[PDB]
């Protein structure tokens, strides 16, 4: 059954996500304004959203049970490599099938394929990014499953540069077993059918999304006029 420890983990991750994810999107007023007039028009706005979103993912990560027993260097390696992935996962909450967009409360803050293009990216990222969002949306995850998936993604033992892999694995295992066991006990069929394996598949799709983004990001940022439009946190975390 679902153990007391496993119930505790889920309660922790729910609370952590709620503290780091404002479904009103009120802080979006602090971002440089969006412009949809203009090459890289949306880059200041979306650089800021991502920089904020990075901070929030760190604030989530810190509250993952076990995460803090990790050295600071390993915490750093895990956040640096997962940040884009967790922003992709956490964005599914604003993403809407109704029109294939991220809907953050108001027309001003509603982002589509054209907007992400006006931030320096192409369809080689955006198309499989949208398809990921659609496949993840169709799983109709319980918020419990959502927060566990983000957590499992942050604490991945294979990320390069991880010194204490075995501890990262043991931490991830606790969360994976919590998730397998939660699906079995609380997610009724047919929605539960192979749901775990479909969740892990999404982690594999995210590796490919990460790679592509890193490469488009390298190309974008090498141009010192675009790197000017980013934030210092985006520069340190994604690279320079």
């Amino acid at each position: 059954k679902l153990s007391e420890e496993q119930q505790h983990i889920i309660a922790i991750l729910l609370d952590a996500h709620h503290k780091t994810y404002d479904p009103t999107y009120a802080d979006f007023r602090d971002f440089r304004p969006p412009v949809r007039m203009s090459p890289l028009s949306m880059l200041p706005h979306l650089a800021d959203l991502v920089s904020y979103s990075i901070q929030k993912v760190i604030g989530f990560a810190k509250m993952i049970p076990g995460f803090r027993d990790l050295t600071s260097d390993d915490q750093i390696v895990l956040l640096k490599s997962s940040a884009i992935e967790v922003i992709m996962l956490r964005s599914n909450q604003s993403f809407t099938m109704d029109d294939m967009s991220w809907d953050c409360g108001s027309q001003d803050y509603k982002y589509d394929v054209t907007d992400v293009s006006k931030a320096g990216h192409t369809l080689e990222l955006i198309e499989p990014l949208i398809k990921f969002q659609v496949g993840l949306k169709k799983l109709n995850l319980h918020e419990e499953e959502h927060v566990l998936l983000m957590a499992i993604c942050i604490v991945s033992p294979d990320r390069p540069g991880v010194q204490d892999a075995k501890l990262v694995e043991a931490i991830q295992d606790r969360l994976s077993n919590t998730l397998q066991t939660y699906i079995r006990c609380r997610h009724p069929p047919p929605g539960s059918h192979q749901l775990y394996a479909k969740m892990i598949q999404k982690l594999a799709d995210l590796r490919s999304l990460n790679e592509e983004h890193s490469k488009q990001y390298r190309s974008l940022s090498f141009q010192p006029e675009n790197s000017m439009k980013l934030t210092p946190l985006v520069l340190e975390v994604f690279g320079n």
Binding site: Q75, I76, E236
Partner: peptide, 11 residues
Amino acid sequence: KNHPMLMNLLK
């Protein structure tokens, strides 16, 4: 390793 802002947000 030279990640002052990340290390700050993590402390």
